[PDB]
Design an enzyme around this catalytic site. Structure first.
Site, mmCIF file in Angstrom:
data_model
loop_
_atom_site.group_PDB
_atom_site.id
_atom_site.type_symbol
_atom_site.label_atom_id
_atom_site.label_comp_id
_atom_site.label_asym_id
_atom_site.label_seq_id
_atom_site.Cartn_x
_atom_site.Cartn_y
_atom_site.Cartn_z
ATOM 1 N N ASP A 170 1.439 -1.341 4.487
ATOM 2 C CA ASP A 170 1.959 -0.012 4.102
ATOM 3 C C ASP A 170 3.437 -0.114 3.687
ATOM 4 O OD1 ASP A 170 -0.585 0.818 4.857
ATOM 5 O OD2 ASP A 170 0.078 2.255 6.381
ATOM 6 N N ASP B 195 -8.093 1.156 1.233
ATOM 7 C CA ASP B 195 -7.839 2.203 2.259
ATOM 8 C C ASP B 195 -8.837 3.369 2.280
ATOM 9 O OD1 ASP B 195 -6.385 2.705 4.543
ATOM 10 O OD2 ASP B 195 -4.925 4.044 3.533
ATOM 11 N N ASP C 185 0.934 5.266 -0.424
ATOM 12 C CA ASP C 185 0.196 6.559 -0.422
ATOM 13 C C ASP C 185 0.983 7.615 -1.209
ATOM 14 O OD1 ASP C 185 -2.186 5.872 1.427
ATOM 15 O OD2 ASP C 185 -0.420 5.489 2.776
ATOM 16 N N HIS D 217 0.867 -1.196 0.000
ATOM 17 C CA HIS D 217 0.000 0.000 0.000
ATOM 18 C C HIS D 217 0.895 1.234 0.000
ATOM 19 C CE1 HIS D 217 -3.520 2.459 0.364
ATOM 20 N NE2 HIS D 217 -3.071 2.974 1.506
HETATM 21 ZN ZN LIG Z 1 -3.610 4.841 2.319
#
Ligand SMILES: [Zn+2]
Ligand SMILES: OC[C@H]1[C@H](O)[C@H](O)[C@H](O)CN1CCOCc1ccccc1
Length: 998
Positions: free
Chosen positions: A308, A174, A62, A60
């Site tokens: 993450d 998410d 971001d 994951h």
């Molecule tokens: Zn996220």
């Protein structure tokens, strides 16, 4: 076309109905804290009925949160993708899924040709699989459907161009709750499956108990089921490894092999798999898988494997791959398990699930509704981020419009590569696409990252303005004269609403003088595909200004003073040096109109002057002196439109629609929410109010009343808000300049109070696409009755509706019969423990914009009391259009404009009011011999209350050689139109068309 009003769809799960009959009890479920002790019959499995397990590695990433896009790229993501290329190439059986194409494009363009071809090889053979293939994994609450489609298009266009792949499986692990806007767009973009994670723990339990975690998600109005998309809801608290192997995180954490400077909160570490322990380790893990599998209807099990920014270090790749391979080798070779386990991709999971379905092994339930508002535990409802960082929430809508206008204005022509149109539009699309991220528009990123998003969006706005002004100069300059300097500013844009003169005094004054410069050309653009009349305003150096079209026909105008508000008491001051000229621009569909502002000695024939009343000041050459007076009630009417009464504090108290109709009470009021002293603190994500909101003491505020023939307004300087009601002859416009200042642990809310007999019913929109029925539930806490207000909300009874339309996404509710309320801003000292590690203390002044539509609906055809959807009126829809896609204003930069024409698009079809050309985009650069233009058409559904030419986009540009109905991304042909006419689209449908030209 389906009727989307009279017929209610029949679905197994209707989320408003489910919500009504759920208890939402937060029972301790055991090892699965929010579920129960899962039990399976072990005789369920045998050599002819094995469990098929796909373990899907993922990371994951971001595009901004704790760090910026570029900081994460350099610190984390470029290492993850280097190691994926290396480890997958080296290990043909290893699999990996990738969602964020913004990071993948950043990485891929930096590779040598050798690595690019190596990368292509692991995509071609299905080892690296793209899921969704959006630029980002977007927010689903605050995002406009147009921007969701934009960021999807940008990611999938990159994948098609550079990887020759188009994902048909979506992965959304998410976003903080989920919208049916996603399947709507995905199913019209070629998708077959989607996966979601962040849904309320009580919804997970409820669906899990009925094995309704896989469902055919259709739109709330869809009787037929043609919008249906297969959806997998994951069952547990997180997408992390402890919450993806099975119900007991203390066991699953032992199969996250990276946790040997990370550890297991349940205090049993993972152990390297050996011949000594593989029998026991395998027994523990397969038991978890078989419990997870009891929640689903097929013998195919999805086991995500990641977290993450995982798979950063080559040794993490080793330790995860080698330990899982030892488990797979043992399990597959041991018949007593009756499991086949292996590394897999998301598409592989869904393919196997549909193979099981076709073979009669499972039939799946149908579902309609949304998954807002999300709670991950107890009363921790994530309604905070509906409002967090409202400045950038507003900026999103401004940039959305400018990208649409810039792409539409520039689409009319092929441009020389020297103009750098394509470069600017690509920058603008990508900065706006990036902001759709679930830590962008949400306002859930660190201050320095919010600054990056802001600076990116500011560069994007500048890029759009340069494209728009070049385009307008080309469209309105005689072709025999047109000789462009592609680096020149032919026009400056004038925007009354962003950032707002109260936020930054930045608007240019048009300086006229009979001496220095007597007249100025201004130009209005109308991106909507119908004739539009809208009042426009400009700043001028003199009040003695007259408006003409280019044909020298006079145009009625009004001059008002320029007012600003100041502290030391909040009081208005007036300019002596600049004035507003206001007039009605009439602009063709998707077209342009030129007008002329001209100075004179004194009051021209066709320009009126506004009176000013200050209730509690020179104005240079402004020919009406400011009147003064004590605080008192006031009533204003502009044109034939409504009559509005205001309290002695300058807040609306009533609306009279027509001369012979009642004075309907409609009170604006400002209140405040606080933060809990003990227990859970509100933060960027969570709204945890310390009880109902409290009135804000208004004191004796100064009320400014401006009254004119074309436009009147009441403004008041309240503590934290300059409140303004503007009247132009229809639904009024509300503007709040919101400066929450130093008010720590405060949320400011704007409430409307009516005698509308709404009860517990209200309506809110999803992504500006659809209005969904909400029911206020006293069994849920206050923050759970807060929903996203991305573009509007309404309440109604048998007779009366009140609709509030927004220029920005904010959080809101109807917490009592006849009320609407909408949060303006929030300042929070505390972190809310979702990993951001700060509060929200970076507030800045923002100008919020609204339209307020009071209407009689007793003669409107409304949906059944059982229908889960509501629909706007013509008036409320046009009002939303006014906020999101206003007229664009251009001031000619130079003293003189040779070749100037008066109109563009006079011949453009004026389409039915419920039709929009959401997107017009030229798909080809100049060097292509067949030019191609993409169109997205959206038809909304409006209530029939008892009151145009056909638009064929295929024929808008000349020399059409063919026309295809496409996916909304433009990437696949769905229907060849031999006829080269686009058929018109059904209510609540969106279709894309690509026209080819010779
Ligand atoms: Zn996220
Ligand atoms: O905590 C919620 C979200 C964050 O906001 C970031 O998006 C990050 O990926 C972690 N995730 C959980």
């Amino acid at each position: 076309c389906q009727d989307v009003v009279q017929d209610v769809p029949n679905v197994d799960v209707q989320m408003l109905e489910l919500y009504d009959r759920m208890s939402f009890k937060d029972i301790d479920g055991g090892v699965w804290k929010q579920g129960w002790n899962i039990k399976y019959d072990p005789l369920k499995y045998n050599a002819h009925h094995k469990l098929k397990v796909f373990v899907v590695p993922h990371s994951h990433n971001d595009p901004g949160w704790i760090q910026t896009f570029e900081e994460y790229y350099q610190h984390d993501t470029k290492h993850i993708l280097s190691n994926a290329l290396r480890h997958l190439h080296d290990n043909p059986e290893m699999k990996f899924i990738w969602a964020e194409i913004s990071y993948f494009a950043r990485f891929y363009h930096d590779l040598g040709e050798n690595k690019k071809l190596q990368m292509k090889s692991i995509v071609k053979n299905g080892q690296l699989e793209f899921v969704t293939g959006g630029w980002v994994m977007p927010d689903e609450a605050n995002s406009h459907w147009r921007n969701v489609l934009l960021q999807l298009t940008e990611g999938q266009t990159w994948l098609k161009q550079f990887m020759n792949v188009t994902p048909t499986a979506s992965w959304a692990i998410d976003p903080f709750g989920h919208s049916p806007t996603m399947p709507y767009i995905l199913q019209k973009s070629g998708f077959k499956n989607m996966l979601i994670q962040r849904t309320h723990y009580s919804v997970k339990k409820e669906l899990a108990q009925q094995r309704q975690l896989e469902f055919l998600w259709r739109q709330i109005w869809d009787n037929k089921g043609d919008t249906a998309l297969f959806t997998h809801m994951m069952p547990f608290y997180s997408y992390d490894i402890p919450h993806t192997c099975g119900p007991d995180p203390k066991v699953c954490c032992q199969f996250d092999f990276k946790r040997m400077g990370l550890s297991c909160p349940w205090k049993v570490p993972p152990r390297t798999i050996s011949d000594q322990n593989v029998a026991a380790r395998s027994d523990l893990l397969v038991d978890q898988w078989k419990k997870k599998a009891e929640l689903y209807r097929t013998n195919v099990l999805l086991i995500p494997l990641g977290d993450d920014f995982r798979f950063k270090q080559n040794t993490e790749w080793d330790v995860q791959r080698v330990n899982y391979e030892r488990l797979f080798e043992h399990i597959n070779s041991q018949a007593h398990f009756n499991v086949q386990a292996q590394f897999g991709t998301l598409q592989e999971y869904f393919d196997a699930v549909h193979q099981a379905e076709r073979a009669g092994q499972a039939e799946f339930p149908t579902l309609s509704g949304d998954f807002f508002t999300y709670a991950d535990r107890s009363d921790n409802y994530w309604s905070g981020y509906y409002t967090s960082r409202p400045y950038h929430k507003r900026m999103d809508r401004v940039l959305m419009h400018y990208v649409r206008a810039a792409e539409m204005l520039s689409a009319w022509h092929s441009w020389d590569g020297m103009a750098r149109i394509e470069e600017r539009l690509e920058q603008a699309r990508r900065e706006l696409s990036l902001f759709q991220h679930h830590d962008g528009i949400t306002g859930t990123a660190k201050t320095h990252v919010v600054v990056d998003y802001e600076q990116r969006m500011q560069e994007a706005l500048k890029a759009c303005q340069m494209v728009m002004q070049q385009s307008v100069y080309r469209l309105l300059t005689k072709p025999s004269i047109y000789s462009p300097d592609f680096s020149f500013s032919y026009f400056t844009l004038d925007d009354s609403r962003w950032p707002g003169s109260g936020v930054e005094d930045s608007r240019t004054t048009i300086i006229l003088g009979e001496d220095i410069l007597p007249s100025k050309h201004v130009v209005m653009h109308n991106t909507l595909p119908h004739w539009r009349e809208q009042l426009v305003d400009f700043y001028v150096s003199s009040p003695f200004v007259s408006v003409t079209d280019l044909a020298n026909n006079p145009v009625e105008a009004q001059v008002s003073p320029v007012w600003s508000w100041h502290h030391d008491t909040i009081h208005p001051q007036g300019s002596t040096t600049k004035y507003r000229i206001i007039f009605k621009a009439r602009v063709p569909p998707m077209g342009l109109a030129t007008y002329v502002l001209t100075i004179s000695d004194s009051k021209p024939e066709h320009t009126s002057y506004a009176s000013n009343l200050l209730l509690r000041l020179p104005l240079g050459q402004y020919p009406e002196d400011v009147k003064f007076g004590d605080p008192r009630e006031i009533s204003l009417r502009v044109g034939n439109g409504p009559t509005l009464a205001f309290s002695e504090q300058g807040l609306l108290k009533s609306i009279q629609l027509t001369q012979d109709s009642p004075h309907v009470p409609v009170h604006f009021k400002f209140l405040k929410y606080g933060v809990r002293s003990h227990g859970d603190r509100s933060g960027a994500y969570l709204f945890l109010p310390n009880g109902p909101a409290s009135p804000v003491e208004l004191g004796q505020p100064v009320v400014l009343v401006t009254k004119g023939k074309l436009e009147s307004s009441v403004s008041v300087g309240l503590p934290s808000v300059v409140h303004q009601t503007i009247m132009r002859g229809g639904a009024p416009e509300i503007r709040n300049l919101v400066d929450i200042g130093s008010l720590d642990n405060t949320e400011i809310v704007m409430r409307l109070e009516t005698h509308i007999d709404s009860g517990d019913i209200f309506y809110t929109d999803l992504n500006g696409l659809q209005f969904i029925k909400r029911r206020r539930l006293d069994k849920l806490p206050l923050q759970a009755n807060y929903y996203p207000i991305p573009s509007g909300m309404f309440i109604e009874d048998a007779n009366t509706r009140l609709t509030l339309l927004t220029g920005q996404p904010l959080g809101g509710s109807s917490l009592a019969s006849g009320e609407l309320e909408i949060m303006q801003d929030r300042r929070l000292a505390s972190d809310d423990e979702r990993g951001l590690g700060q509060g929200v203390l970076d507030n800045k002044p923002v100008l919020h914009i609204y339209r307020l539509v009071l209407e009689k609906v007793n003669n409107c055809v409304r949906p059944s009391e059982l229908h889960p959807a509501g629909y706007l009126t013509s008036a409320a829809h046009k009002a939303s259009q006014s906020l999101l896609d206003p007229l664009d204003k251009f001031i000619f930069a130079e003293n003189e404009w040779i070749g100037a024409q008066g109109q563009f698009g006079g011949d453009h079809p004026s389409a039915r009011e419920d039709l929009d050309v959401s997107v017009m985009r030229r798909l080809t650069k100049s060097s292509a011999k067949t030019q191609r233009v993409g169109y997205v058409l959206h038809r909304t559904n409006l209530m029939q209350c008892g009151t145009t030419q056909k638009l064929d986009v295929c024929h808008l540009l000349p020399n059409v050689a063919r026309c295809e109905r496409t996916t909304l991304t433009f990437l696949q042909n769905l229907e060849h139109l031999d006829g080269m006419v686009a058929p018109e689209v059904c209510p609540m449908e969106t279709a894309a068309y690509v026209s080819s030209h010779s």
